[PDB]
Design a protein around this ligand. Structure first.
Ligand SMILES: Cc1cn([C@H]2C[C@H](O)[C@@H](COP(=O)(O)OP(=O)(O)O)O2)c(=O)[nH]c1=O
Ligand SMILES: Cc1cn([C@H]2C[C@H](O)[C@@H](COP(=O)(O)OP(=O)(O)O)O2)c(=O)[nH]c1=O
Lengths: 135, 138
């Protein structure tokens, strides 16, 4: 599956630490949209979809969570809990996020404007799209 | 001086809160780069420059800090301390940030790639370039 764990370069100066993201700097794509997710309750789950076009980098900026990614062929669990690590996934990877700490802040970077129409919410279709050897 | 304290529209769902930023959603520019600053020790200070092209939104995702902004003629101090608000500033505004809490995480959105040639680190010449721009009609 087309995922990587990225290790960010930081700039340690002025008694603090700076992490930069842009095309070719701790990010393989061109950024167009950012969002962050916070104030999680005990059984919060996010995701349950794949996206046709958007690539993602997920970064836990505070606290931590889990993510299960799935390409139709294999699955992986990933822990995010570190400001110098990110999970990069290509488009057409199903994901769910859960087991959020109380204090988790999740930052997501993507290369597309939000488009409800690029979403795949039906898992069987997703798996047909990833595996069906006719097409 | 051109700045705005934004109140963000949040999406409250799935037992959590989502804040989205892109052109015309909680941000007036096209995003091209993001950065965040953290692990501040007591006396830490950031900024001390102006930028010729870039606009910015500053958000305290966690904790709090104070920002001073300066148009060459006046200055203004603002506290950043929660996730539903940020400070938009236009280009060619000088800024300095200080009084960071130990747990402060500062997130910044901007509309450009990083460019050393866009920085003005000398306040005196900041005021001259800005006074000239203002003089021109800007
Ligand atoms: C990610 C995102 C979501 N939303 C809205 C639409 C969705 O109904 C809701 C949550 O998005 P969605 O991606 O469906 O949930 P998750 O973040 O768990 O994957 O917020 C936007 O308006 N813009 C966005 O960029
Ligand atoms: C913001 C930023 C800084 N840097 C480098 C250049 C600077 O010497 C240093 C700090 O940036 P600078 O903007 O000069 O300081 P501050 O963050 O306090 O305003 O890190 C980058 O390489 N890319 C970036 O996007």
């Amino acid at each position: 599956m087309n995922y990587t764990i990225l290790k960010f370069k930081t700039i340690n100066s002025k008694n603090s630490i700076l992490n930069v993201h842009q095309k070719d700097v701790n990010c393989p794509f061109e950024i167009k949209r950012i969002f962050y997710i916070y104030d999680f309750l005990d059984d919060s789950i996010r995701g349950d979809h794949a996206n046709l076009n958007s690539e993602f980098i997920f970064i836990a900026l505070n606290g931590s969570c889990e993510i299960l990614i799935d390409d139709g062929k294999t699955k992986q669990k990933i822990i995010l809990n570190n400001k110098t690590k990110g999970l990069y996934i290509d488009k057409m990877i199903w994901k769910q996020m859960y087991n959020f700490s109380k204090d988790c802040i999740l930052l997501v970077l993507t290369n597309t404007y939000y488009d409800e129409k690029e979403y795949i919410y039906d898992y069987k279709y997703f798996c047909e799209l990833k595996n069906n050897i006719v097409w």
